[PDB]
Amino acid sequence: NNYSYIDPTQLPYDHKWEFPRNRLSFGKTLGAGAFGKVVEATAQGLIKSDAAMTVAVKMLKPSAHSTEREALMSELKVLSYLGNHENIVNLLGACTHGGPTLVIIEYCCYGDLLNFLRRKRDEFVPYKFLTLEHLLSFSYQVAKGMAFLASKNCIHRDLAARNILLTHGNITKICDFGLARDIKSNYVDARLPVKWMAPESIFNSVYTFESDVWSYGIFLWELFSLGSSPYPGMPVDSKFYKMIKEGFRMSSPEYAPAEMYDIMKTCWDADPDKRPTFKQIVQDIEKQISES
Ligand SMILES: Cn1cc(-c2cc3c(N4CCN(c5ncc([C@@](C)(N)c6ccc(F)cc6)cn5)CC4)ncnn3c2)cn1
């Protein structure tokens, strides 16, 4: 074996990302968990030497096991190897010298798309405030980012509206690459997002390009239901797993177009080989928007 796939996590950390820790001033906490948190912060001199810049900083608590500490470094290396993309919460810098590792990423002023839809749900119109054309753009942008991930042999493993952020110009970005993996055939694997997971992920812990496509289909349902929870009225229990295995699927949300719901049904196919690729999803949605 003289040819091998270059493992992004095995590559050395590039010190081009290194940013002085004392030049960050922390603000409100954006997200919190048992392992760590993400805070809004001000970076002085990050892009321009004399200009302060609003950023988000992902950090672990000192009471963190070594597996979580290297998971944060692995996410940092994935984001650097992946490269910049418009539909990704892009890496801006890192603070690895001595102190606790800090990962500086883009700040999205509007927050997660799930909470955004629930705010705008009361004042939504299909045609003339959130509109239908916004929903089509959001599904198109997230598909491009996922297609970009899949084009780098990478899976996200936690695709959902809560992990899609909105920023200026109605640009959506995929965030939280903590569970992102480089598949090169599939990846086999904590609390899991069962209602977004493909059946093969629930039953055999297998994660693929196709399992991301399943989660994308669940995301489209979140999108066109104006932020409702998936499988409403069904708790994650023994009956839930049985109905999924047998072929139960959510019906079309109220505002979903027929060709958008058609994508959801192909995303939710029991056979992964019959699920569409993200590249196919982009062209389908792209044709839709021009015809719109
Ligand atoms: C008006 N408004 C604006 C925002 C907003 C919110 C973000 C954001 N996210 C915040 C939420 N996220 C996130 N991710 C991972 C975790 C953890 C708990 N699992 C974690 C944390 C650290 C760690 F070391 C390991 C795990 C928590 N929270 C994703 C990023 N990023 C950028 N801008 N932004 C802007 C929210 N309201």
Numbering used by the authors: 566 to 693, 763 to 818, 821 to 825, 829 to 931
Lines quoted from the article behind this entry:
Avapritinib is the only potent and selective inhibitor approved for the treatment of D842V-mutant gastrointestinal stromal tumors (GIST), the most common primary mutation of the platelet-derived growth factor receptor α (PDGFRA). Against this background, we solve the crystal structures of avapritinib in complex with wild-type and mutant PDGFRA and stem cell factor receptor (KIT), which provide evidence and understanding of inhibitor binding and lead to the identification of a sub-pocket (Gα-pocket). Furthermore, we report the identification of a sub-pocket (Gα-pocket) located in the N-lobe of the kinase domain, which is surrounded by amino acids of key regulatory elements such as the Gly-rich loop and the αC-helix.
Intense screening and optimization resulted in two complex structures with avapritinib in wt and gatekeeper-mutant KIT-T670I. To the best of our knowledge, this is the first report of a structure of T670I mutated KIT. In contrast, in the T670I-mutated kinase, this position is occupied by the isoleucine side chain, and no water-mediated contact can be observed. Additionally, the introduced hydrophobic isoleucine is close to the polar scaffold, presumably contributing to a reduced binding affinity. Based on their MD simulation, Winger et al. suggested that the T670I mutation confers resistance via distant conformational changes within the Gly-rich loop, which we cannot confirm based on our complex crystal structures.
